Amino acid sequence: DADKQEYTGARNARFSIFPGSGLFKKPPKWVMVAELVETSRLWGRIAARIDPEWVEPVAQHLIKRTYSEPHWERAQGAVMATEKVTVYGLPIVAARKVNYSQIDPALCREL
RNA sequence: UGCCAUGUACGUCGCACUCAAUAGUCAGUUUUCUGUUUUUUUUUUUUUUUUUUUUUU
């Protein structure tokens, strides 16, 4: 979380890095942890920084894709939408412009 | 360039400035706050914090 030393994990749960880590003082924007433990709060024991272009290919059965702002763009002759990819409610890509016309064939033929 | 008949009618007069003072009507319980200057600046960005536990050709 921005300017906050707490992490949004799976579902609405929030956690923090176990203080014995070396990156406990160096927080990443995107972290993966080994053990979730509830003692005083939620703690991920062994933590490591990740790059969020990683988790779409390896969670294909878990990704939910939400497409907003379907607008027909002339230059492609095709409809664009902003896609958001999430697992467990975690917004992996906040915004990616993608071809809504290539996604669905039903209405884009008429358009 | 000589002459022009007689008698025949008159008087006196007036004008102005104005006008003041007046009726009757007694009284209203005690006590009270309300009140004044003076330093003026009110307001300035922050952070990472703990650990049941035990076994795998």
Q: Are A69 and A81 in contact (CB under 8 A)?
A: yes
Contact A72, A109 (CB under 8 A): no
State the virtual CA torsion across A36, A42, A44, A50 in degrees, nearest 10: 110
Cβ(A78)–Cβ(A72) below 8 Å: yes
CA(A62)–C1'(B44) in Å?
49
For strand B, the positions having any atom within 7 A of a protein Cβ are 46-52
CA distance A33 to A107: 43
Angstrom distance, A102 CA to B6 C1': 177
> Element (H or E) spanning A100, and its range?
helix A100-103
- Give A34's strand partners: none
E strands in A1-111: 7-8, 14-17, 31-33, 36-38, 42-44, 47-49, 64-73, 78-87, 90-99
Nucleotide nearest to A37 (CA to C1'): B51
Beta bridge partners of A84: A66
Q: Are A85 and A78 a contacting pair, CB within 8 Å?
A: no
Nearest nucleotide by C1' position to the A35 CA atom: B51
Tell me the technique behind this structure.
Answer: cryo-EM
Distance between the alpha carbon (CA) of A46 and the C1' atom of B27, Å: 105
Tell me which residue has tokens 């002759």: A77
